[PDB]
Amino acid sequence: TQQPIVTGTSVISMKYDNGVIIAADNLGSYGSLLRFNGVERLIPVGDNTVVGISGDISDMQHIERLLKDLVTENAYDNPLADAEEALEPSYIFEYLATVMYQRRSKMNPLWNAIIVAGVQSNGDQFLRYVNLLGVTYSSPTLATGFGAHMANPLLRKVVDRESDIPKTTVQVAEEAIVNAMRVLYYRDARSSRNFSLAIIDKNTGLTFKKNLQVENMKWDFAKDIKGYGTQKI
Amino acid sequence: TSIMAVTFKDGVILGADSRTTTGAYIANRVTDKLTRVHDKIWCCRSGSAADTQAIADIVQYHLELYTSQYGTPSTETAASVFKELCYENKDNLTAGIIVAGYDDKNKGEVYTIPLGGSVHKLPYAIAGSGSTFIYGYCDKNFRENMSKEETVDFIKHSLSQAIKWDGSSGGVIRMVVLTAAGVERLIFYPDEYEQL
Amino acid sequence: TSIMAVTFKDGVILGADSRTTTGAYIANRVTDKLTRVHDKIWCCRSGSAADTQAIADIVQYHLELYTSQYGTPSTETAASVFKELCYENKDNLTAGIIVAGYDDKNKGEVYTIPLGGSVHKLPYAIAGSGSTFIYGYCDKNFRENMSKEETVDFIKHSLSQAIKWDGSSGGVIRMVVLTAAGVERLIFYPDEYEQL
Amino acid sequence: MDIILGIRVQDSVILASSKAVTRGISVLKDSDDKTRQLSPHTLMSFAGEAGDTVQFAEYIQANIQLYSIREDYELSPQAVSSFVRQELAKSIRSRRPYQVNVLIGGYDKKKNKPELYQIDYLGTKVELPYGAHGYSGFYTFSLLDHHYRPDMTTEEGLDLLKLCVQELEKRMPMDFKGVIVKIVDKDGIRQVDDF
Amino acid sequence: MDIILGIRVQDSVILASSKAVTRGISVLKDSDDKTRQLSPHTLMSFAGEAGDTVQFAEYIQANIQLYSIREDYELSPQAVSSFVRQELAKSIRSRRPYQVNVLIGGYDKKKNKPELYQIDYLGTKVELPYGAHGYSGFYTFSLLDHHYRPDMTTEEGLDLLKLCVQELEKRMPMDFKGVIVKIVDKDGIRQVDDF
Amino acid sequence: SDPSSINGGIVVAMTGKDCVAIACDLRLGSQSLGVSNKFEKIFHYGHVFLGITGLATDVTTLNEMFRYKTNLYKLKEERAIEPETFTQLVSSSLYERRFGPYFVGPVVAGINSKSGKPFIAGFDLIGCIDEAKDFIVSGTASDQLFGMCESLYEPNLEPEDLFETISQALLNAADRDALSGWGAVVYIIKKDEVVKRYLKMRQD
Amino acid sequence: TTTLAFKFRHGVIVAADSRATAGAYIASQTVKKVIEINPYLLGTMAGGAADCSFWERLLARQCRIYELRNKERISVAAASKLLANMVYQYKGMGLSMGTMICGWDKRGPGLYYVDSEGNRISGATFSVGSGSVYAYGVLDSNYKWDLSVEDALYLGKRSILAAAHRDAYSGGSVNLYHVTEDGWIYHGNHDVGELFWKVKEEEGSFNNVIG
Amino acid sequence: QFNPYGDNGGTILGIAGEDFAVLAGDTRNITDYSINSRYEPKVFDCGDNIVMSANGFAADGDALVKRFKNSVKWYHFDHNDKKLSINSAARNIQHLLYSRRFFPYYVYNIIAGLDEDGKGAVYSFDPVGSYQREQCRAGGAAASLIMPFLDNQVNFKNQYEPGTNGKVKKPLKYLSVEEVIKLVRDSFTSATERHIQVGDGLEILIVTKDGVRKEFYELKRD
Amino acid sequence: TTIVGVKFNNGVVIAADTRSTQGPIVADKNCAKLHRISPKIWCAGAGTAADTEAVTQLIGSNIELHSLYTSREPRVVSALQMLKQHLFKYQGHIGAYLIVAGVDPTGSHLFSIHAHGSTDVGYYLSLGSGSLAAMAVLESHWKQDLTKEEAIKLASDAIQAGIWNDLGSGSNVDVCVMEIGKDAEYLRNYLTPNVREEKQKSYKFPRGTTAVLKESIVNICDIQEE
C-alpha cells in the first residue's frame, strides 16, 4: 500500500474505421503543483501499439521499462520478431493486466490507469483499459480520470455504438479527440495545454505527434462577467 | 487562487486569476475575485467562495451605511470592518482577503488580512495558494513609486508565474486600477500572458 | 531545505543551504548537503538526513564497485542507482535527491529524483521545502549556456530568496562547481547574500 | 431490569416480573417489585436502565392519580396506555431519553374485558394477548404460541406462566431470582404470594 | 468457563468446578466436567476461553501420560505444576496465547501430603491451602479466610465448600448450574455424586 | 440500529380505472423478533388514505398528528380534505422536522371527490413528494416491490383486476423480505365505496 | 437459521430450516443445512454457509479414508473431534460455524455440538442458530427418552416451526432426518407456509394468528 | 489506504428448463456513476456444454472464469477427455472459491447447463464457495428486484386456482424456452427501469443437448 | 442530476433531467426539477430533493410578498440574494444546488447557487452529477449571440449528455424559456427519448388467484342522520 506522488491526469482514446487514436497531456503534477512540463505519457510498443498511462509517474516509468524489456525478450530466438511473431496489442495488454492484478493481490499496486491502443495482425482495432485494481473493460471510446467524465460523452456522440465505427473517418476522430483535450484544459485543474497524440492505422501505420497545443480557445466572454451577482462595475 | 494588490505612484492596482475549483474540477473558469465594497475601495478574495462573498456583502453594507452618515470612509476603516468579521468569526471562516483603496489624502493603500484575522498594511501584498510560488519573484522585482505601465507588467508577470505552477489558479488575469482619474478594469487572456 | 543544480556552458553547479531542523530547533546550522558519490558526480540531499545519508553511502559503494570493474560511470547510471533505491524502498524512505555530474562526452547533466522515486532529466532543478518560493524567480531568470559567473549569481540569488522565506532553510550557501578543470567548492555567508 | 412478562386471559391480566436488582457482579436485592399501581384496575410493570425505570413509573403514577382525583373517574386502560406512549415518544427525542420498557395490564370495567399493552422506550405500542420485554420473549413466546387460548382461566394462565418461568430458569444464563406475580381483574389488583 | 474452586485439607485436595457452558444468551450444557485426570493422583481443573481450555488441558494430559509410560513412574504434583506453568509462560508470548486458568490438585505419595497449585494464563504459579480463579475468589475468600484450618477433615472441607457455593448462588448474577466436586487423596481420584 | 428497518414493514399503492388501491403488511417486529401480526399501517382521514412505513412509534405519532390536523381542517373549512391538499400537508409537516426527522415512508392514496381523479403520492422521510401516475412503494422490501410493480402493473385496470395485481405485488415482495409479512391488508377504493380485504399468506 | 437434534430411545432426530439471508434480503429458501457425511453420519450447518459446507465435506473425506485404513466406520466422537481440531487451527481468523455431528456407532446414538469458537460438547439435545432460542422451549417441554419415532419426528418438526414463525432469519421449509443403527433416513421437505396452517388447525396452536 | 476491491455493477439470471437452461446477464460495466462499457460480455461458454458468469468485482470475476476454463482444460488432460458434468464443475468451483477464504473473490457466480439425465441445471455460488442447485436464480445488483418476480411467474408462488379460494395451488406446469426468454427479457426491462447499474444490453446464452446458442437484446441506455 | 442554464439574444433558458435516485434505485422516473420562484423567475435544483423544493417555495413566497409590498415585478438578484443568505446561514446542511434564471425590468439574468451560499455568474452553467458531461457539450458548442432556437437545442443536448452518460441522470428533458417582453414558457417533457418498450407478456391474473381470509366494508362517510 502506498500513495501516488507525481501524477499524470486523463488519457483519452477512441476507435475509427481503419484504426484507433489515443492522446494524453505532457504534465507530471505534484499535488496542486504543476511540477514537470515535459513528461511523455504515451509509450509506443513496436509499430502497432501505443500504451497510454495515467496515475503515478514512478510506476509509469517502471511499466515503461517492463515494456522495453518485453520487446527485447520477444526478439530472443525469434526469426519472425519483425513479422508473424511480433508483439500484438492483445499480448501487451494481457501481460500488463496480469501484472496489475497480481500487484493488487499482494496489496502493493501499480497506482495507474492504462489504455492499450493498437491494431492487430488481421487489421482489427484493439482498445482496452486496465487499472490498479486489475479491472479491465473495452469500449469504442475509453478515457481515464477526468476524461471518463468529460471526454467520453463527447467521443460517444461520434461513436455511440459498434456500428458507428466504420462510419467514422480519421479526420473526424482526430477532430473529436483534439476538441476533448481542449475541454479538459478548460475544466481539469491538473491538466496542461501541451499534449501528445498517436494514431495507429491499419494502412498508414503508426503516426506519433508530439508538442501539440490546445488552440482556438474561447475566453473573450470573460470581460463581460463582473462580480458574483449584484456588482455592476 | 492567485491574488495581489500593488501600490504605485498614481494609486493602487488589484490583480487576480479567474479559477474556482471543487477539488480538481474547475467549477468556474471566468470568476471575478476582484470585488467592490466602495467606489474606490476594492478587495481581492481567496479561500471559501461562500465565506468571502458573505463577508464582502456585509462590508459593502457597513460602508454604504457609514457613507450615508459620515461621508466617504478611508481604506483603513474598510480594512478594519473586514478584520472585525474575520477575527471574531475565525473559528467558522476560511477567508484570505486583500483590501486596496485610493484616497486623495492617503493615495494608494494596501492591507492584507490572512486566516487569523490579523491586519498588515503593506506597499504590496500577495495571497492565495498560488502566491507561494512568486514570493521570490515579487520580492526581487517590486519597486516603490512605479508607473501604471510598470505596475501592470509587474502584476501580469507575477500572476502569470503563479498560474503556471499552481493548479488552483488559472483562466484570465483580471485587474482593477484605482487612481484619482477613476476606476479602470483590465483583462489579459492566456495567449497573452503565457508567452511571457 | 533549499537545494538546486544548474547546467551551464562549461558544466554544472550544485547549490544548497546549510540548515538542519528538528521542528523549529536548528540542530545544525553548517550542514553540508552537497555530497560526493563519485569524483565528478555529486548529489543534493533533501528530506530525512538519515535516509539520504544511508542512500548516498550505498550509491557511493555501488559506483566505487562499478568503477573497479567497468571504469567511470555516467551521470545517468548514478541517477539510476539512486532511483532504484528510492523507488523500491518508497514506503520506508523520505528522500528528495538531485543528481548532478560532469562527463567529457555528455558534459553537464542534472537529474532530479522526488519522493516517489521517479527520474527527470532537466537543464536545471530545484528541490526542498524552500524551492516552492522560487519557482517563479528561477523560471524567469534561467537561461541555457550561461557562464560560470552568471550561473553562480543565478544560484546565489535564487537560494537567497528561498532562505529568506523558508524557515527550514538558512545558514551559509554552499556550492560545488563541476567542470573539465576539476572540482571547486564555494561558500557564501549571510552578510553577502542577504543584501542582494 | 431483566424479565417482565404479561398474559391476558378470559377475565384477567397476569403480570410476572423478576425480583433481582444488579449492580455489576453483585445482586443488591432479590425481592424487588418492578410494578406500580396506576389506578385500582390498571397495573404497570417496567424494566430498563437504573433510575429511569422508577422515576418514569412514579411520574406516570402521579399523573394518572391526579387525573382520577380531578375527574372522580378511572381512565380506561387504553387511555392510560396512550398517555404513557406519548410520554415515551416525547422522551425519545429529548436531551436524555427515559430508557424504560413497560407492560400495562388493566381491566376495563366499561367493556368488562382485560387488556394488555406492550410499550417500549421508543413509544412503540401494541395490544397483545401475551407479551414480553428484552430477552424474555425469546424463550417464552414458543410456549405461549403453543399453549395460549383466549378462553383460559386465571389458574390455567398461572400454570402456563410457571412453564414459561421454568424454561427461563433452565436456558437463561442470568439468575433473576424468581418472579413476583400479580393479577388484574374486575375486583382490582392482587399479588400471588406463593409462586 | 466460570467458577473453579480448590481447597487442600489434612489428607486430600477438593476441587469444585461449575457445570454450565454458555454461548451468548444460551446455556448449552448444565453437566460439563471442567477437569482432566493428569495422573492417578493428580487432577487439573480449568477455566478460560472456549476451545483453548480443553485443547490445553488435553495437551497437558497427553504429555504427563507420556512421561508416566516412558519412566513407569508418577510425577509429583509439584513437578506437574511446574511443567504446566512453563507451558503457560511459553504460551503468553506466542502468536496466540492459551487463555486458560487452572488449578492443580494432587496427592504426593512420597511426602504423604495433599498439594494445591493455582496457575493463571500468564504462568503465575502459587501453592495454596485454598484458591479460586476469576470472580469466584471475590465471594468465597472471606469465608475460607474465616473457617479454614489445615487439620480439617474431608467432610469438614466439603461443608465449608457448600457454604462457599451457597454464597456464590446468592450474590453472583450468573447461574452456573451448580458444581461437580472431586476429591484427590492417597487412594486416587473420586467424584462426589451428591452435592 | 437503522431506525427505518428496526420494526420492518411495507406499503404499496396503485392507480386503476376510476379507482385506487393501497395495501400493507401486518408485521411489527424488534429486528429479528416478530412482535405483532395485527399492526396495520394504513389509516384514513375521511376519504383520503395514508399508509406509513418505518419506525413504528413515528407511524403511530404521525397518524395521531394527521388525525389532529385533518379534524381541525374540517371544522374550519366545513369540508373533508382532498388527497392533493393532504399531500402538501404531509410534506409541510415532515419538512418542519428537517434536522430531527420522523423516520417514516408515507404513502397517500385517494380519489378527488370533485374531479373524480385517482391520486397517489409517496414521500421520503423529509417531505419530498413523488406524485406518480402508476404506483408508489415504501418499506424494507421497496426494491422487491419496485421489481414486482414495474413488471406486473398495467394502466387502466378495473377494481377487481387491480386487487389481484397489487396483492400479488405485495405478497411476493414480502416473501423475499425477512422484516415483512405476517399478514396483509388491501384497500380497494372507489369514488363512494371502499372494500377492505385481508389476505392469506405464509406466517414465517 | 434454526437447526436441532436430539438423542432418544430409537436413535437421533435431526431437523433444520432452509432459509439463507443477506441482510434483510432473503437470498434462498431451499438450503440444505443437513449434510450427508456418510450413510451413518449427519452434520448440521449454521452461520457461514461456505465455512460449514467446505469443512464438513472435508470431514466426510477424512472419515472415508479412516474407514479404508482401519476397516471400520469412524465414531461420532472421533469425527466431531477431527472437525474441532481442523477449525481450531483457524481460530480468530474469522470462521463462522455452528454444527452438530449426529450418528449411530458402537456406543449407540451419538450427538456432538461443534463450533468455530472451539467448543465440542456431547449432549442429548441441541439447537443452534438465530432461532434456536424459540426451538428450545418446545423441545424442553415435550422431550422424553421414551418417544416414538412418529412423535419424535413431529417434535423436531414442530420445534423448527416455532422458530420459523418468530425468527425473521428462519423459515422456508423443514428438512427432517431420522438416524438409526441401520443408517439415516430422510423424512422429506416440508414447506413452512403449508405446514403452519396445517398445524394451526390440527393442533389448535397459534390462536393469535388469523386463518 | 488501498482498497483492493471494487464494484462493476451488473446483474445476471439463470433459469433451468425441462431439457434446456439459460444464463442471462446485462452487458453494462460501471464504476460509481460512470459507464465504462455498454457492451462488455459477462456470460461465457466454458466448454463441455457449461456456461458461467461471475458477477460483482470484474477483476475477480475474470480471474475465476479464467481459472475454471483452465480447470476444464486440465480435467480433459488428466482424465482421458472425459466430459465434466455440471455437478462436478460446481464442486470444483467451490474449491476455487474457498482457496481464497481469507481474501475472497468478490463475486456471485452462476453456472448453467444440463445434468447427466439431460435435464436443465442451474447452480448458484456465494463468494466463498457455498453452492446449491436451483431452478431459478438472479444474482448481482438488481437480484432483489428480479427474484420475487420469478418466484411468482416461474414457481407460481402465492398463486391459487380460482373458485377454490386458497385451498388448491396453481399446478407447477413446465415452461418452454420461448416462455422463459420472455420472462428473462421482462425481468431485465423492469430492472433497467428502477436500477441505474442495469441497462445498455442483454445477452442470453441458451444451453441444450445440441450445444450453446446466443441471443442479444438492446436495453435502455440512460 | 443534470441541470443547465444558457443565455441567448433576448433572454435565458434552463433545463433539467427527470430522474430521482436513492442509492442505485430510481425513486421517480418523471421528477420535476424546474421550479417557479415567480412568473418569470425559474430555478433548476440539484442535490437533496426536499431542500431544493422547500428553499424555492420559501423564497418564492417571500418574493411574492415583496412584489406586492413594492408594487414592482420581482428581480432575479433579489431571489439570488435571498437564497444565498438563507443557504449560507445553514452552512451547507440544506443540500440545495440551484441554477437561478429569469427576466425582469433590469433584463435577463443567469446565476448558479451552491449549498454553502456561493453564487456565480455566467452565460452558460451546469450543476449536478451529470454537470461534467453537460459542461463538455456546452464548452464544445456554446458561442456568443445565440438565438432562442439555438439555445434550447444547446441546453437539451447538454441534458441528454447527462442522461446518457451519467447514471444519476435519466428519463426525460424539461425546459423553461424566459424571453424579454414575453410570458415564460414551461416545456414539461420537451423530449421523451426513454419510453419503455412493450412487454413480451401480460401479467394480469385470473380473478380469484389470491387467497382471502376476510372481507368488510369501510365506513368513509360521516355519522348519518335518523
Ligand SMILES: *[B]([O])([O])[C]([C][C]([C])[C])[N]C(=O)[C]([C]C1=[C][C]=[C][C]=[C]1)[N]C(=O)C1=[C]N=[C][C]=N1
Ligand atoms: B481560490 O482557490 O482561493 C478560490 C477563490 C474563491 C474566492 C473563488 N477558492 C476556491 O476555489 C475554493 C476552494 C479552494 C481551493 C484552493 C484553495 C482554497 C480554497 N472553492 C470554493 O469555495 C467553491 C468551489 N466550488 C463551488 C463553490 N465554492
Ligand SMILES: *[B]([O])([O])[C]([C][C]([C])[C])[N]C(=O)[C]([C]C1=[C][C]=[C][C]=[C]1)[N]C(=O)C1=[C]N=[C][C]=N1
Ligand atoms: B531539509 O529541511 O530538507 C533538511 C535536509 C537534510 C538532508 C539535512 N532536512 C531536515 O532538516 C530534516 C527534517 C526536515 C525538515 C524540513 C523538510 C523535510 C525534513 N531533519 C532531519 O532529518 C533531522 C533533524 N534532526 C536530527 C537528525 N535529522
Ligand SMILES: *[B]([O])([O])[C]([C][C]([C])[C])[N]C(=O)[C]([C]C1=[C][C]=[C][C]=[C]1)[N]C(=O)C1=[C]N=[C][C]=N1
Ligand atoms: B442461518 O441463518 O445461520 C443461515 C445458515 C446458512 C448455512 C444458510 N445463515 C445465513 O443466512 C447467513 C447470514 C446469517 C443470518 C443469521 C445468522 C447468521 C448468518 N447468510 C449466508 O450464509 C449467505 C450465504 N450466501 C448468500 C447469502 N447469505
Ligand SMILES: *[B]([O])([O])[C]([C][C]([C])[C])[N]C(=O)[C]([C]C1=[C][C]=[C][C]=[C]1)[N]C(=O)C1=[C]N=[C][C]=N1
Ligand atoms: B439529483 O441527483 O441531484 C437529484 C435532484 C433532485 C432535486 C430530484 N437528487 C436526488 O435524486 C436525490 C439524491 C440523493 C439521495 C440521497 C441523499 C441525498 C440526495 N434524491 C432524493 O433527494 C430523494 C431520494 N429518495 C426519495 C426522494 N428524494
Ligand SMILES: [Cl-]
Ligand atoms: Cl467567487
Ligand SMILES: [Cl-]
Ligand atoms: Cl546531513
Ligand SMILES: [Mg+2]
Ligand atoms: Mg494553473
Ligand SMILES: [Mg+2]
Ligand atoms: Mg414494543
Ligand SMILES: [Mg+2]
Ligand atoms: Mg417474511
Ligand SMILES: [Mg+2]
Ligand atoms: Mg421467520
Ligand SMILES: [Mg+2]
Ligand atoms: Mg417472521
Ligand SMILES: [Mg+2]
Ligand atoms: Mg438503466
